């Protein structure tokens, strides 16, 4: 298991998200669904030139899986997936400029709901989750598990769990007072309100 420090601006953004009083927490789901949608567009675009890139799965979809026993909400996609490099430094480097602009916007009167306009919408997961686990599998690499409970660090390990073929799975270990995002009616309401025009099927699993 490898442990990494977040870049200073990312650690600062995650602390802001965890510490700021902000009741409109539900926007985390739109951000994660939007990220899943972008990765599905990426594999779809790549498959047009190289059809063999879909040999690890033709179906392009998003699954929302609540689990009251484990207190988790899992967002699963069959998108392009991430390499070890994407998890360790590639996406964290791009996120530095977006974090800075978002921080400036907040100081100028913007609110946490506009986070996605800065390409750092993923971190809104920490409005509701005490820990986030990300399992991913790209065609050119092995299966990896990224994990963080904030606090300035994240881990990356080769995933020994069940192979997922291709795509990304975001496991939100919810805070004790945020279990409403495990309720079927609540997830349905949020999906209809913020993610109604996503170009991929979104299946809300039931328990
Ligand atoms: O399909 C995903 C779902 C995601 N949800 N949230 C995260 C963010 C993230 C990154 C690193 C480590 C941890 C989280 C996603 C990332 C991916 C994904 C897979 C491949 N490209 N791509 C991606 C999508 C949008 C922006 C950047 C990359």
Q: Which of 108, 101, 188, 132 is nearest to 18 (CA)?
A: 132
DSSP 117: G
Ligand 1 pocket member 187 (CB < 6 A): no
CATH code: domain of residue 63: 3.30.565.10
In 3-state terms, what secondary structure has residue 67?
strand
Assigned token pair, 57: 């799965």
Residue with the nearest Cα to atom 18 of ligand 1? Answer: 39
Distance 191 CA to ligand 1 centre (A): 19
What's the CA gap between 178 and 52, in Å, rounded? 41
Range of the domain at 112: 1-207
As beta bridge partners, residue 170 has 75, 134
Domain count, the chain: 1
Is the C-alpha dihedral spanning 60, 34, 31, 167 positive or negative? positive
């Amino acid at each position: 298991v490898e442990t990494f420090a977040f870049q200073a601006e990312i650690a600062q953004l995650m602390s802001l998200i965890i510490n700021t009083f902000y009741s409109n927490k539900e926007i985390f789901l739109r951000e994660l669904i939007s990220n899943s949608s972008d990765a599905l567009d990426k594999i779809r675009y790549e498959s047009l030139t190289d059809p063999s890139k879909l040999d690890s799965g033709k179906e392009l979809h998003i699954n929302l899986i609540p689990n009251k026993q484990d207190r988790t909400l899992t967002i699963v996609d069959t998108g392009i997936g991430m390499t070890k490099a994407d998890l360790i430094n590639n996406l964290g480097t791009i996120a530095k400029s977006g974090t800075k602009a978002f921080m400036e916007a907040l100081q100028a009167g913007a609110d946490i709901s506009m986070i996605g306009q800065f390409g750092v919408g993923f971190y809104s997961a920490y409005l509701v989750a005490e820990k986030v686990t990300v399992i991913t599998k790209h065609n050119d690499d092995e299966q990896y598990a990224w994990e963080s409970s904030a606090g300035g660090s994240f881990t990356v390990r080769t995933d020994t769990g069940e192979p997922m073929g291709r795509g990304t799975k975001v496991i939100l270990h919810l805070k004790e007072d945020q279990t409403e995002y495990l309720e079927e009616r609540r997830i349905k309401e949020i999906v209809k309100k913020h993610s109604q025009f996503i170009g991929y099927p979104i299946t809300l699993f039931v328990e």
